[PDB]
Structure 1
Amino acid sequence: MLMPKKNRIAIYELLFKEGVMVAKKDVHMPKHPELADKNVPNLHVMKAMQSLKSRGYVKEQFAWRHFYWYLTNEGIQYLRDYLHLPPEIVPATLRRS
């Protein structure tokens, strides 16, 4: 899998706090223009979220070398089924009426 765990827990926390992102399709690249400055090296962070969304039970939308992920009900349902953290930590999805 080529992944550590400490950065893994940190990236789960970051993914909780953000939820919806757009990512590039790289693996070993620690310099991504739009996903820097997370107090963690960007290689582990960016690959980590790619693997977080690419387990086999969450969809994607991708072309032109870029991953697009929108928070469907499958994202929230897998959040519940895997992390077992209820959404009362309010995400960025419950605004903009």
Structure 2
Amino acid sequence: MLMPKKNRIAIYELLFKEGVMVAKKDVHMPKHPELADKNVPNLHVMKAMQSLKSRGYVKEQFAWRHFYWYLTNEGIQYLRDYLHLPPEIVPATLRRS
């Protein structure tokens, strides 16, 4: 799907920071609630997560109206190589606090 590169950067940064993603399955929602002040439509998030799922990077669940996505190890490696993050950075999920 066609979208500006900064939207993809923001979505991937949020996904790697948190480790999980939630969406409402609303292609007409003007902007994702979590991605505020960055002007990312919900449709872009849905399609980006679908593209990630097709490659095995994220695991998907659907509940009552919502998409839930969890990050896989190969997805972690792909995001780390994509965002040029140092090997000392891990998502908040992988930290047993």
TM-score by shorter chain over 0.5: yes
Q: TM-score, normalised by structure 2?
A: 0.59
CA 1:2–1:89 in structure 2 vs 1: closer, same or farther (change >3 Å)?
same
When structure 1 is superposed on structure 2, of 43-52 and 16-25 the one drifting more is 43-52
Deviation at 1:4, TM superposition (A): 2.0
* Structure 2 segments unaligned to the other structure (5+ residues): none
Instruction: Give the alignment's Cα RMSD to 1 decimal.
Output: 3.5
CA 1:35–1:71 in structure 2 vs 1: closer, same or farther (change >3 Å)?
same
From the two aligned structures, give the one with the greater helix fraction.
2
Aligned length: 97
CA 1:35–1:65 in structure 2 vs 1: closer, same or farther (change >3 Å)?
farther
Q: TM-score, normalised by structure 1?
A: 0.59
From the two aligned structures, give the one with the greater strand fraction.
2
* Structure 1 segments unaligned to the other structure (5+ residues): none
User: Aligned equivalents of 1:83 and 1:35: distance in 2?
Assistant: 18
Percent of residue pairs bearing the same amino acid type:
100
